[PDB]
Design a protein around this nucleic acid. Structure first.
Lengths: 92, 166, 109, 87, 97, 81, 97, 93, 107
DNA sequence: ATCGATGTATATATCTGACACGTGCCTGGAGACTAGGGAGTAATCCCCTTGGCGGTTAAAACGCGGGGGACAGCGCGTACGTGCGTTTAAGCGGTGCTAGAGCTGTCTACGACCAATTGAGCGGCCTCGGCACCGGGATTCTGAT
DNA sequence: ATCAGAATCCCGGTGCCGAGGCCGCTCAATTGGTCGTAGACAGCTCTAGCACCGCTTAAACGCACGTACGCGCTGTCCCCCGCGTTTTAACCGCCAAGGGGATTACTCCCTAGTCTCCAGGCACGTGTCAGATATATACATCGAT
């Protein structure tokens, strides 16, 4: 039971370029990219929680980790996306 | 359909630049009235809720070199009813002077000195000519006065004007 | 388990698995507890970054008049974008090649 | 007594003799004339990055003071681990 | 009376590689730090230890950058470091694309 | 397996340099590059064999190599991880 | 009997190998070298084919980046030819031993 | 009340250079160094344990993290010292 | 019953108990073996003994009796292994190695 | 500066493997519910950060003269590119073999957890000596002669 | 050379403040006992890593010649360096206020853990089409007669 992000990257692709496919090697590369950015953000959120003597990783910690790791405009837009998603999630 | 609107840093900087140019050459001057201050003379109350980095005014005047800058200020000061309107600045191996005694339709020259106001001035060069911009470097309320620093530490003038330190 | 179930992703409006992200934040030894909005936030950010890369990759593949995104197109997108190249600056992309770039002092006269 | 109007930068506080002292410590024997503006630009970029990260750490801890641990953590984030400030 | 140009340079080099104190001056550096941080969050405060940490880090950075710059210049058969040397050092180190 | 670094032939290094943008190549570049490559490979393979030994395996795997490289500071996308 | 000036063929090879993505080192000699080097550390090792391909991709990316910086060093020295002093300067500035 | 490695660094000092002191600044620097190396070794051991899908950090994981993080001779001698300590610690009980 | 610190069982001057507490509360793994903190404390003690020995040699060669950041810097930057280990590390108040390139010395 | 190889983008045929899609299922994700402890919030105290004043003096800024160091030009020779004939060994496809990865089942030793306790570590105090400093004999570098 | 002559190192002695030893307290490390579960070990299957062998042919290699460039040398011209004077503003001490960092106490609500339900994602097998050659068309490029 091998874990991947292949089907979700397929979904995002068919959402961005609805008439474009993606080879298997590029699929593996996008898989590795998602794994790596996840590992980075999670490790940075862990470091923040340890610094501030907290115990829970929360949206506050994840937002600060995003702001630390992504450069300027990527960070602004990613924080926008995540805040929008969290508000929608707690509303629903 | 899902398309990113990211505007790479070059685009953001260029757009801020063009906004600066068209606003300076727009003469809008949104919400600034001349009034009186209890001891200083005139006052320009801004009536907008400023924030960090936003524009305020342009210190419109005449730009010259330094060989005449070190002279024209004193030559206008020979008239003891001249106020304070000329601005020097050192930029790329040259110092200049903003001749602003001759009255203009702008709101730059109409402000007094302090170190406890709300503005710290920068420079913008719209195609060479360095326009003395004034930005809101902090949060200003609609009903506070434009008040910035002249940078001048002329010990003679600060002797005659003890109010320059404030 | 009544009140027919919908995925946390669907509740959040995302395409990435919020449940899997939660499971990874738990079985990853990052912290004892894990908030409820943390997986949602992280999945939203990961999906955003994936969309941001795939858009440029598809644009490159369409420039080269192709239909399948390939490692070359991923490399081109990443290296040409100014900020993705800073986020992924010390990253090698297998079968990616380099950007076409000849220094100006080597060209003929 | 009419007075003139000038500016400052707070980046010209990294004076030319200070940059030359740094260069001497680095082993530089002779210094060009534009090295000073170039070095001020470099230093402002480095400082902007480290202080952005330190202020982010501070904001996250809901503090209003930038402690020394915030600077140490920012520097470790850049990859320039700094010893001797409570790290 | 007079020294040949270069001897005072080498004397300064030996002096500043013997010592350890900070070469930038603390009050101007602190003003610079405060004005820079003023653009990320207004009404900030800095532990004096934090400003000292920033200064140690910045001086170590600039010293290492000047060592790399000197290497570039020497490589170019020169002795005077130049902005092109600083730029080459930064680009090879990976700080500017 | 003796003297296999000579398997990075001169035209191979010249191809790598062409990809890098190099126009002319001094003749002493080739031994220097063989040395550089042997050093980089020694480091990465030492870390990969360490990961393998720790997993009590005997096959260096793509993940062991990817982890070695991620630890060198040279993350590699496209082989798992 | 046609013949190009020295340099145009080099520029064409540059454009070619920057258009392509395939591996530029011979797979079997590279694999043999890797098996030797590993044999130095632990005897009777096996290798996944994907493991050796990963090693090759990483080594090729390393050498390509090193040659980009070597070319920058050469151009700095007002040359066109890269040289061992250029590789050594690139590595020293870049932080390698 | 804040923890540090001051008294233990001082004990190791009085072991290696019996008539020699250490200033407060160098004491802080050795504190930072001990914390940094501890964090490196522990993070690498954690990462190894996650790689092999195991839950327990052991002397095996710590030894591999030491052999990954320290350069050749330092790593060899640190492995020597750690193995010596673990054997002496298990002998007594 | 009478107690003796784990550090004494192992012959270490570094705190095995403190190291074990740090390994636990540091969120490295769900479990921490018995010999893990012993091994880690032994390695930390060895490394600090190396650093301190070289710094004391530097202090002797300077005809001083206290170790200072400058002496730590000299020790580290001179030992090749410790310089590869702490290569990306700045040491406050440490200064640089005395090194003037030959091309600048007077001919 | 056309000629004329010489290589290169544009087009069509096509076909081969890889990709996108339909299926069954099982395993992990979701929903409800309970317990507890982590964190949010309010209060308080005092530390330590900021700001201003005054004087000193060390350091920065400025101006000047001059020399050595960068840079442009020039000539030479050499070593690197380009091309061609030859060799060699990479690469591809076959098979076969078996080592070793990977998964499963059992069971035990080991680590978490919990409570009683005690001594090791920490914070404050005090003293003395080590390093800094200030002034002095010497000798060891540069630099005009 | 020839020498002086300023920096510079070795030398005492004072002095001051920081570091090293001392001691009382408290909290966290040690000990003992229980348990439950992780991983150690054995077993078995069966993928895939290795080895080999033959053919093809693409790439490496060796040689020869020419010429573009690396490199040494020369000349100039200018732009850094060294020095002396002035100025300015860092710095140090002192005071004085007050923000906010750090700790504590309380309460609540959010997350872990558990159990059950079930659907979505994964392996698996299949149809089909994208893109990689292959050859031809027309064209671009450049090197030289």
């Amino acid at each position: 039971r091998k874990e991947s992000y292949s089907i979700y990257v397929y979904k995002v692709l068919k959402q961005v370029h609805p008439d474009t496919g993606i080879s298997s090697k590029a699929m593996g590369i996008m898989n590795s990219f998602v794994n790596d950015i996840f590992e980075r953000i999670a490790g940075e959120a862990s470091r923040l929680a340890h610094y501030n003597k907290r115990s829970t990783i929360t949206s506050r910690e994840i937002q600060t980790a995003v702001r630390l790791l992504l450069p300027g405009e990527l960070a602004k837009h990613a924080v926008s996306e995540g805040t929008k998603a969290v508000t929608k999630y707690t509303s629903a | 359909v899902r398309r990113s609107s990211r505007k790479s840093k070059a685009e953001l900087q260029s757009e801020e630049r063009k906004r600066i140019d068209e606003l300076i050459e727009s003469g809008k001057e949104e919400g600034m009235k001349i009034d009186l201050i209890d001891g200083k003379g005139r006052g320009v109350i801004a009536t907008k809720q400023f924030s960090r980095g936003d524009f305020v005014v342009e210190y419109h005047g005449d730009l010259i070199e330094i060989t005449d800058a070190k002279k024209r200020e004193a030559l206008y000061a020979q008239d003891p009813s001249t106020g304070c309107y000329m601005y020097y600045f050192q930029y790329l191996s040259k110092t200049y002077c903003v001749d602003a005694t001759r009255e203009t339709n702008r709101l730059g020259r109409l402000i007094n000195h302090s170190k406890c106001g709300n503005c710290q001035t920068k420079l913008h060069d719209i195609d060479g000519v360095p326009h003395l911009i004034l930005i809101a470097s902090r949060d200003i309320a609609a009903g506070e006065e434009l008040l910035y620093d002249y940078g001048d530490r002329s010990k003679a003038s600060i002797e005659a004007h003890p109010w320059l330190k404030h | 388990a009544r009140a027919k179930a919908k995925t946390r992703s669907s509740r959040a409006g995302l395409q990435f698995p919020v449940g899997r992200v939660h499971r990874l934040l738990r079985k990853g030894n990052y912290s004892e507890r894990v908030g409820a909005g943390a997986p949602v936030y992280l999945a939203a950010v990961l999906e955003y970054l994936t969309a941001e890369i795939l858009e440029l990759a598809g644009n490159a593949a369409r420039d080269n008049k192709k239909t399948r995104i390939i490692p070359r197109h991923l490399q081109l997108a990443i290296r040409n974008d100014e900020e993705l190249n800073k986020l992924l600056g010390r990253v090698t992309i297998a079968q990616g090649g380099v950007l076409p770039n000849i220094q100006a002092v080597l060209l003929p006269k | 007594k009419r007075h003139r109007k000038v500016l400052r930068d707070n980046i010209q506080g990294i004076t030319k003799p200070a940059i030359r002292r740094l260069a001497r410590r680095g082993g530089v024997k002779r210094i060009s004339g534009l090295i000073y503006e170039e070095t001020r630009g470099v230093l402002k970029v480095f400082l902007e990055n480290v202080i952005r990260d330190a202020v982010t750490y501070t904001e996250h801890a809901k503090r209003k003071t930038v402690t020394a641990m915030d600077v140490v953590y920012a520097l470790k984030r850049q990859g320039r681990t700094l010893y001797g400030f409570g790290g | 009376h007079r020294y040949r140009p270069g001897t005072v340079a080498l004397r300064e080099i030996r002096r500043y590689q013997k010592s350890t104190e900070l070469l930038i001056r603390k009050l101007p550096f602190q003003r610079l730090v405060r004005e820079i941080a003023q653009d990320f969050k207004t009404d900030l405060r800095f532990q004096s230890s934090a400003v000292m940490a920033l200064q140690e880090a910045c001086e170590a950075y600039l010293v290492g950058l000047f060592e790399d710059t000197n290497l570039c210049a020497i490589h170019a058969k020169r002795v005077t470091i130049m902005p092109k040397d600083i730029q080459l050092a930064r680009r090879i180190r990976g700080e500017r694309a």
